[PDB]
Amino acid sequence: NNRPVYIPRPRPPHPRL
Amino acid sequence: RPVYIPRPRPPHP
Amino acid sequence: MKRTFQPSVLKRNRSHGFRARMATKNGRQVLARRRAKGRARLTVSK
Amino acid sequence: AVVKCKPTSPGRRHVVKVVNPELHKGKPFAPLLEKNSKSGGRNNNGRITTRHIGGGHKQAYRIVDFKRNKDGIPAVVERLEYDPNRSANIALVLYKDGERRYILAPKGLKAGDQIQSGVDAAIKPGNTLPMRNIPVGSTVHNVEMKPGKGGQLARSAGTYVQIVARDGAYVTLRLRSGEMRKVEADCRATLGEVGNAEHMLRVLGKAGAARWRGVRPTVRGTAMNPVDHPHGGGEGRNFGKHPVTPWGVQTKGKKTRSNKRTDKFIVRRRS
RNA sequence: AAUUCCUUGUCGGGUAAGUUCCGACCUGCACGAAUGGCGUAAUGAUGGCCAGGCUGUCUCCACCCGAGACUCAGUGAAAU
RNA sequence: GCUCGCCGGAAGACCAAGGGUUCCUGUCCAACGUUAAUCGGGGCAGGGUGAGUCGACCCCUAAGGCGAGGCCGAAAGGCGUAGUCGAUGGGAAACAGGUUAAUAUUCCUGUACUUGGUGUUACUGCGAAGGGGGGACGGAGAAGGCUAUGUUGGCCGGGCGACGGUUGUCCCGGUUUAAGCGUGUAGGCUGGUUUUCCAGGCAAAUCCGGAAAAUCAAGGCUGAGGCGUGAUGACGAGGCACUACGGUGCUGAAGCAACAAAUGCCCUGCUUCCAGGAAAAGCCUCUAAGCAUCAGGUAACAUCAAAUCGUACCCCAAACCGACACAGGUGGUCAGGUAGAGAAUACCAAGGCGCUUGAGAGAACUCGGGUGAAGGAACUAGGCAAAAUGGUGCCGUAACUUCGGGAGAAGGCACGCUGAUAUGUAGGUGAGGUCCCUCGCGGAUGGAGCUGAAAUCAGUCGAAGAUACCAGCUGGCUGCAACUGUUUAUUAAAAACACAGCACUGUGCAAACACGAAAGUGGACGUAUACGGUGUGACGCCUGCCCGGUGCCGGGAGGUUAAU
RNA sequence: AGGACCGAACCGACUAAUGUCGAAAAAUUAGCGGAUGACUUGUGGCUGGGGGUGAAAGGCCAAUCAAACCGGGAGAUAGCU
C-alpha cells in the first residue's frame, strides 16, 4: 500500500567472475 | 495550538 | 548513534524563521510561494 | 643563547631552543596592547585564500612605533620584551616627557640605553635619522618607503640594509635579498641591525611545535587525485609533469613580478 | 629484494622432513642515488619466521551449568 | 505486608538543551501496552506552576550579522564607515525551618540584604560620547592553611534478647543548626608621606605618567577558615492520644571532643616554562563646554518603587534525537561506608529497581559459560580463538645505542593470622599547667589524649597466604616507516597521509599568490632570519655522468610574422 | 620538564564471536589504542554545488556524493525491453 521509503542497499557476496 | 514561550527556568543547582 | 537532527530552537528560528526569510528577496519569494499555496504555517514559528 | 636539550623522549631529541635571559619575565605594558583575532586564512568572503593557516596560541598585538616621529625627545630603554607577532624582540622605551612606546630592538640595545630621533641625533645604534644625514656605507634597519609611511625594510630578526650610494635626492640601498633599490633621501631609517640574530637557529623539534605556531599541515600535490591538483593520479608515484602551482601556474623558476610601476626604483635584481 | 618470469636460482643454518624464514654468491628478464641510495637506537592494535611456557586448537571428543529449540495458555509476523 | 534478588561515579539526586501537561485527584477498559489488566506516560473530567534577591528581560561586548551616507556592480546585488544587533563571557542584592494529593531560596514563621525616585536636615563646586585607573584573564607544578565530609570516644534515650553466652571495655539510634552582622587571623601583594616642576595622556586637568628634593621606616590593599551574635529560636531519637485506619495532633533529652581529610576554598595566589595567554560596560577618579543666590554632589533619617515573562513534570530517559514504551546517542553539578594507590574492582548505605508474556519438560542442534584422563599446535592459509602470565618489596638484568634508552629486559627470593620488641614502635597531631607578652585568633617548655606505617624474632593453621574481584605472556632473527599523530562515518588503520629537518623556486611590500565582472578582503596590522609554491621526509655516510628532447631563465646577428 | 610511562572517566575502533526478514538502516559481549595533548567537548558563528572542506580516501557536505537536495525546461531523448 505504501512504498517503503527506505530501500536497503545490498552487497555482492559472490563476484562470479 | 502552537506554544511560543520556551522561557528559561533554571532552578539554583 | 548520533542522528542528523539535533533540535535547537535558537538555531531553527535564526535559520528558517520568519525574519530570516524577509531579510533576503529569495526568502520573500519563498513566503510568497507558500502564501499562494495556502499553507497554514508560513514558516517555523516558535 | 642556543641550548640543546637532552633526548629524554622522542620529540625532544632534535629540539634547539633560543633563550634570552634579559627578556622581561612579566606581563607586557597594557596601554599599548590590542586584540588580534585570528583569521585562519579566510577573507571577507569566508573562503580560504591562503592555505596552511589556522589554530595556534592566542596572541595579543603590541602597537610598535615604526614612524618614530618623537623628534628631539631623549628616551631611555626601560626593558626588552618578547613579541609574539614578530621574530625580533621589542623594547619598551620611556621618553623624557613621560610617554612610553614600543620599538624594534637592534642588536646593541640593553636596559637603560639612550636613544634619540630626528636629524639632530647621534650615530649610535637605535637612533632614527633621515637617510640624507646617515653617512654612506652604514648599516640601517626599519627603512621607510616614503616620508612618514613608517618603515618596511629590515624588520625581521638580524636583518639590515647597506647604503651604497647617494645621487641627488635619492639613495641606493642593498637589501638582504641582494637587490638594490632606490629610495628617497627624506625617508627615515634606524641605525644598527635588528636584534635576535640567533632566531634562525631554532628547529622547533617536533610536529606540534609548528602546529601551535599557527601553521597547518601541507599536503603534497602528488599525494592528491587528478581532480584536486595538476599533479596526482596514477599508481606507484607517477609524476611525468612539469612542476606547477595548484592553480596551474608553472613554479620552479618562473618569474611572476609584473608591476611596471616601481621598476624605475629597481637598479639590480636578485641573482 | 614490497623489484626475479625461467625459479622451489646455488650453497649453508634451522626441522626426521622448510615453494616460508635467515646468511652468502651475482646469470640485476626489469635496483640505484632528494618521484633520493645504503645503514640506523627507540617506537608500531605493522609483514614474515623460530623458541620456551600454555592450553579442547587438535588426536577425539565426554560430562555439566544457564538462554533458545520441544509441549501447554495468550498475542501474532515476514520474504514467496 | 513479609522474604529473595539487582544498581549504588548509578539503573540514585539535580539541571541546561529538547519535549509541551506526560504532573496530581476522581472515574472508565473500546483502541493503545508485543499477553491478561481492576493497572498506566491510555480515554474523559477536574485541579495544579505564586519571586525586588533564581533565570530571562535589561546595561556591555567577542566571533559574526545587518548597515544611514559611501565605494563598486547589466538588473538583482556585493563590500563596508558612523552606528546598531549578537552569550557560549563581564555587570546590584536571601538564607534556614515548616507546609500541599500536586508549587516553593516564589507561600507562611524567623532573621537579612541590594539598586533607584521623592521629602527633611548639615556641608559642599557640580558637570561628558573626553583623559586615567580598574574590570583584565595562558600552561604546568609544588607546599602550607583550611572546610565539606568521615571515623572513634564522651553524652543522651532505649535494650539485655525465641539455638550456648551476654549489666558489660556489650548492642541499637541520635549527637543537626544557615545567610547576614561584628572581630580580624594563616597566607599573598606593594615602601609610604609632603613639596616643587614638566612640549606626555588628539583641548584642559588637583587625575595618570615623568623629573627633583625633605621625611619615616612603616603604612596600605587583599584574605580562606576560626571565633561571638544570628539562636534561652528552629530542628531533634523517642513517647502519648485518635485514625475516613493513608495519616493527624501533643510532647521532646543529649546536641560535645579528638583524629583523618579532599579533585572544594585561601588561589583570577605563589614558583617556573615558551607557544606569551579577549573585549566593552558597571564602579572609582580628573577636567572642557555650561551654571555657580541655582542646579547638582556627599552624609543621615523617613517614605515609595523594583514592572513584565519562565516556574508543573521527564531530563543517560518509556516523556529528548533514533518511524516503536527501540540492548544506540545526549552537556554540567552532588557523589557516603569496608578493603583499595584510586571516580578501578568486590560487597553495601541513602535512594531506586526486578527491565510488560508466562507455566512445564530437561531431545538433537545453536548461543554464553565450567571442568577434563594421556599427549601438547600433531589443528589451521596463520597459535584464529582459548589457555597462560598478571601485585608489592629486595636481589639481579644481555646484544645494541643517538648515552636518554633498551628495561617492568630475562631470571630468583618473601607475602596469612597471633604474640613480643612496643600493656601499639618510628612518625603525625597536640590538651591542661608553667614563663613571657610589640596582649590576643600571640611566642617557648611540656607532654595528656588521639592517630599510626614499616621491619625483626618466635609461634601457629591450610593442598594452596599478591588466596576472591582487579591484575604484562616472554625471548631470538628480519622487511617497511624515524618517532606521537591523521585517514576511506557504514568490509581496507597500513608500508598510505602528515611530520620536524633538507633543498629548489617565486616574492622589495599597492609583494608574490588566492577569493572576487569590480570595489574590497586574506597574505599581514607581517615585510626576505618574512611569506607562497614544489619535491624529499628525523639522525649518520652521502647524493655520480648527461642540456640532445620538452619546460624555465638570458641574448640579440639574421629570417618569418597581426591589427594599422 | 616531557606531542614521556602504566591506567579510569572521556575519545577512537585492531581481533574474535553473536547478530544479518537483527534489540540496532554498523550494534552488543570479551579483549584492544590514545588518555597534558597535533587532545577532547558544550554553546554560537563562517565557508554552498563544477562550489565548499579535506594530516588527501575521490573522503565528507542532513542515513543520498567521480559533482547534494528541491522546483522548473520536461511528456528531454531512447535505432532498446
Asked whether C8 and C19 are in contact (CB, 8 A), the reply is no
Measured CA to CA in angstroms, residue D249 lies from B13, D217, D242, D252, D260 at distances of 62, 22, 10, 10, 20
Asked whether D187 and D146 are in contact (CB, 8 A), the reply is yes
Helix (H, G, I), strand (E, B) or coil at D163: strand
Torsion region of D36: left, alpha or beta (phi above 0 gives left; psi -120 to 50 gives alpha): beta
Q: How far is it, in rounded angstroms, from Cα D215 to Cα D217?
A: 7
Asked whether D143 and D175 are in contact (CB, 8 A), the reply is no
Cβ atoms within 10 Å of D6's Cβ, excluding its own: 8
Q: How far is it, in rounded angstroms, from Cα C26 to Cα D201?
A: 57
The DSSP output letter for D42 is: B
Asked whether D134 and D185 are in contact (CB, 8 A), the reply is no
Cβ atoms within 10 Å of C15's Cβ, excluding its own: 10
Asked whether D101 and D95 are in contact (CB, 8 A), the reply is yes
Domain count, chain C: 1
CA of C8 to C1' of G43 (A): 11
Q: Does domain D1-113 have CATH number 2.40.50.140?
A: yes
Integer-rounded Cα radius of gyration of chain D: 22
Flag whether residue C4 sits within 8 Å of chain B, measured between CB atoms. no
All CATH 2.40.50.140 domain ranges in chain D, comma separated: 1-113
CA distance C17 to chain B (A): 13
Q: How far is it, in rounded angstroms, from Cα D74 to Cα D84?
A: 28
C-alpha dihedral, D45 to D50 to D52 to D57, nearest 10°: -70
The DSSP output letter for D265 is: G
Chains in touch with D (≥3 Cβ pairs < 8 A): none
> If we measure between CA atoms, which residue out of D162, D142, D163, D164 comes closest to residue D153?
D142
Asked whether C35 and C42 are in contact (CB, 8 A), the reply is yes
Asked whether D246 and D261 are in contact (CB, 8 A), the reply is no
Type and span of the H or E element at C20: helix C18-23
Q: Domain of C32?
A: 1-46
Q: Is the CB of D4 under 7 A from strand F?
A: no
Question: Both ends of chain C: CA-CA distance in Å?
Answer: 28
Flag whether residue B8 sits within 8 Å of chain C, measured between CB atoms. no
Return the HEC string of chain B: CCCCCCCCCCCCC
Question: Both ends of chain A: CA-CA distance in Å?
Answer: 39
Return phi, psi of residue D97, to 5°. -90, 5
Q: How far is it, in rounded angstroms, from Cα A3 to Cα D92?
A: 76
Q: Is the CB of C6 under 7 A from strand G?
A: yes
Spell out the residues 6+ positions from residue D99 whose beta carbon is closer than 8 angstroms to its own.
D70, D73
For CA atoms D5, D9, D15, D17, the dihedral sign is negative
All cell numbers assigned to D220: 603534497
Give chain F positions with protein CB within 7 A. 14-20, 51, 54-56, 62-66, 76-77, 79-80, 87, 104-106, 132-134, 136-137, 198-201, 209-210, 273-279, 309-312, 320-322, 328-330, 332-333, 402-404, 482-484, 496-502, 504-516, 520-523, 525-539, 550-554
Flag whether residue C40 sits within 8 Å of chain B, measured between CB atoms. no
Contacts of C46 in chain B (CB under 8 A): 2, 4, 6
What are the strands of the beta sheet with D90-95, ordered from one edge?
D100-104, D90-95, D75-81, D114-115
| Chain breaks after residues in chain C, where C lies over 2.5 Å from next N | none
**Own/partner long-range contacts of D119-127 (Cβ < 8 Å, ≥24 apart):** D119/D71, D120/D72, D123/D191, D124/D191, D125/D190, D125/D191, D125/D192, D125/D193, D126/D77, D126/D190, D126/D191, D126/D192, D127/D190, D127/D191
> If we measure between CA atoms, which residue out of D15, D21, D23, D16 comes closest to residue D2?
D16
Could you give the residue ranges of the DSSP H alpha helices within D156-212? 207-211
DSSP for C31-44, please give it.
Answer: HHHHHHHT-S-SS-
Method of structure determination? cryo-EM
Q: How far is it, in rounded angstroms, from Cα A10 to Cα D189?
A: 74
All CATH 4.10.950.10 domain ranges in chain D, comma separated: 195-271
Contacts of C45 in chain B (CB under 8 A): 2, 4
Question: Going by DSSP bridges, is the β-strand pair D180-184/D266-268 parallel, antiparallel, or unpaired?
Answer: antiparallel
Q: How far is it, in rounded angstroms, from Cα D200 to Cα D202?
A: 6
- Helix (H) and strand (E) counts in chain A: 0, 0
Could you give the residue ranges of the DSSP H alpha helices within A1-17? none
Give chain G positions with protein CB within 7 A. 1-4, 21, 24-27, 37-39, 43-48, 52-58, 62-63, 67
Q: D195-271 architecture in CATH?
A: Irregular (4.10)
Flag whether residue B10 sits within 8 Å of chain C, measured between CB atoms. no
Spell out the residues 6+ positions from residue C16 whose beta carbon is closer than 8 angstroms to its own.
C43, C44
What are the strands of the beta sheet with D188-191, ordered from one edge?
D128-130, D188-191, D139-141, D161-167, D170-174, D180-184, D266-268
Helix (H, G, I), strand (E, B) or coil at C12: helix
